[PDB]
Amino acid sequence: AKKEHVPTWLQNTHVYSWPKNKKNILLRLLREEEFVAPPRGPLPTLQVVPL
Amino acid sequence: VREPGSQACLAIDPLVGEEGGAAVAKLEPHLQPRGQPAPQPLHTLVLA
Numbered sequence: 001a002k003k004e005h006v007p008t009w010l011q012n013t014h015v016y017s018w019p020k021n022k023k024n025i026l027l028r029l030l031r032e033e034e035f036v037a038p039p040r041g042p043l044p045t046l047q048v049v050p051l
Numbered sequence: 052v053r054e055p056g057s058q059a060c061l062a063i064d065p066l067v068g069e070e071g072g073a074a075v076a077k078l079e080p081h082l083q084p085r086g087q088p089a090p091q092p093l094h095t096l097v098l099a
Contacts, residue, residue, distance in 0.1 A: 023067065035063070044052060
């Protein structure tokens with residue numbers, strides 16, 4: 001296959017390639033995130049140094 | 052500033068099982084060979 005063979009409405013999402021992306025296909029089916037971000041921390045306390 | 056050394060982002064990678072353990076198989080019926088002495092229908096006629 002080639003990118004031109006994808007129906008246009010399906011070109012608005014992730015297009016996997018078999019067998020290159022099979023691990024990503026498994027992740028998609030498991031509905032898990034491939035990259036997991038750490039929990040958002042607190043905003044940094046602002047330090048003041050006079051002149 | 053608080054450095055990210057303790058809360059780094061994490062990548063996930065499944066532990067894929069492989070088809071070597073099992074795989075799809077196709078069934079083939081062994082047609083009763085007619086090269087072997089298999090039967091055949093008989094048409095009966097009358098000598099009147």
